Design a protein around this ligand. Sequence first.
Ligand SMILES: *[C@@H]1O[C@H](CO)[C@@H](O[C@@H]2O[C@H](CO)[C@@H](O[C@@H]3O[C@H](CO)[C@@H](O)[C@H](O)[C@@H]3O)[C@H](O)[C@H]2NC(C)=O)[C@H](O)[C@H]1NC(C)=O
Lengths: 164, 54, 223, 214
Amino acid sequence: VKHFEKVKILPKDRWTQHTTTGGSRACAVSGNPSFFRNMVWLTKKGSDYPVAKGSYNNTSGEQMLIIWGVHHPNDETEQRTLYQNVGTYVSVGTSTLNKRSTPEIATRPKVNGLGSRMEFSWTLLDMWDTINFESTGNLIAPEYGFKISKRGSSGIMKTEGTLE
Amino acid sequence: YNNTSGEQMLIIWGVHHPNDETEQRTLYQNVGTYVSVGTSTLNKRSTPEIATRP
Amino acid sequence: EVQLVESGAEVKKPGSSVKVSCKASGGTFITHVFTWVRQAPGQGLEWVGGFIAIFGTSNYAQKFQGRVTITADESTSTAYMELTSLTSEDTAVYYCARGISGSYGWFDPWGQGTLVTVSSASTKGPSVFPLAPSSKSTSGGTAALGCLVKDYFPEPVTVSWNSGALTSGVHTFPAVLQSSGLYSLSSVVTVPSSSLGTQTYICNVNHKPSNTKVDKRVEPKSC
Amino acid sequence: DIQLTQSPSSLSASVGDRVTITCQASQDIRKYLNWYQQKPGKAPNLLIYDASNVKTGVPSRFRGSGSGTDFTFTISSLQPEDIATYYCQQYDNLPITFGQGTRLEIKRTVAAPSVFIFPPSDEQLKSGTASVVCLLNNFYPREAKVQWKVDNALQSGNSQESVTEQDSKDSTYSLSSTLTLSKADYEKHKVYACEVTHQGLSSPVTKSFNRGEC
Ligand SMILES: *[C@@H]1O[C@H](CO)[C@@H](O[C@@H]2O[C@H](CO)[C@@H](O[C@@H]3O[C@H](CO)[C@@H](O)[C@H](O)[C@@H]3O)[C@H](O)[C@H]2NC(C)=O)[C@H](O)[C@H]1NC(C)=O
């Protein structure tokens, strides 16, 4: 892939029933808690976390790279105060795809203060195919897909220096 | 277990899949168990399977 | 049962700043969201902002931007609201209440509030003068006497009549803030006129923050 | 910002009546709407969350209804410990707003102000100010006008007024209008009168006194 063209496929403001405004000190911005910019951390809005549902027909004219995530809490109380229910799921589905993650609340070593983890997965969505997210807990939804704008022989060099 | 040993260490564990519910109760009292093993890199959680086997 | 213990009342001079507290007690820390609703004397409810334990993020109302700053302490399960460049408009009661989720749920329970009083004024206690009942013996009819608890700071005073033994027919009004920057308030009783020569009417007025306790006996007229 | 517009602004009702209050929103806020009660002197108190849900321990007579932009709060039979102001509040959006509040009073048959007038005490007059007091005792409804005339000279900025909370027993109000003069100006003048316009009052009642006569 020689060039990506970012597309807003599942805009953050659509999530009218959940809290789209997460964050942590681990993703800090100016000392203030932030998060990944292309990701949305759907949490509960006042007690409830109803079924989160998302969809996108790939009408952008090329294959599209899409990333999503599930959140693995530390204790049960994290789980309840973030998603209300225990025992949730995070289904993603296309035509080549049918993944249904279910979350693993379990204590762990503090990386960046956090004994909790986000597990991220990914797919290519073919032209005119349709991606569906449905969850009742722990989804970290995408906001964007990347469209493959330029294809060609490229590479990734593992250098630790800079360009002249 | 912290690795205070002076080298990388191969660690093997197990999870026991019982033949019936009674086994599982006379062995571990409760059902709906887990075994969860964690490191920096690793994070597993297996829920054991009760089933009658060959 | 999660309880809320909020800091004591403050009187601050203008242009200074206040920082009030909320210790949340009876539940685990990160399930907490702290919110502050202020309320001016006589007006109603106004959101200041709040803090979400689980993400450590704070939210302000844009009305207050620059002045308000919210923080917390997990050791203490104690959150903090700090208002700066205080003006006399900032005088209000400041309730802390626990809400739910990152969207600030409903607010339960509410604390009892922290009276912040912004005034370049000056903490004296009340002068008590008698509202003496009258030369009209309307007799067969009824008469009104009182006390005028004038010129004190700050709130609040408490008035009772005859050591809590005259409770009936008394009327103790809201205070008023006056030109002076100081408060005042009157308390009155209507009382059968055929008791004007028998009954000893004294009012008992108590201003804590000046620890003034005055019992003033009110006698009628004479002329 | 989302405007929560609560009507009516006040509501006199008899006991046992059903009261309904409304809260309308500048936007669709789904059922993201709660309802508070603030009795006089106390903190607010949650009564209803997510438009329809009643907090445990709130009595049955409180019900909450409403779904999109119009919301309704109903006490089925008013009970004398219900008179309070009530607020609504929204989440959904975020600068978190309240309504301005709806004031519950009790309806009773109208009443007359036992009007009394109090010349300043001699010890206050030792000090340099003189405060003269007019009392309107135990009257309903609470709307009353009180004007100060010293030497038939209508007054201005020196009245300061205060009203009591509605009486638990006879559902009636008391007011206190207090005139403040310099001592000089108090001993300059003779006739101080306090003039009340009410509603159980056919003609405006005027109570008065002349300095140094009884
Ligand atoms: C995802 O969005 C795409 C683009 O709008 C949809 O593709 C289009 O689907 C319609 C419905 O079948 C197709 O219309 C049909 O066209 C054929 C012949 O061209 C005609 O004989 C039929 O009468 C009908 O009108 C259309 O061809 C097709 N376009 C493309 C790019 O192939 C697709 O339906 C969407 N997926 C869903 C269900 O959201």
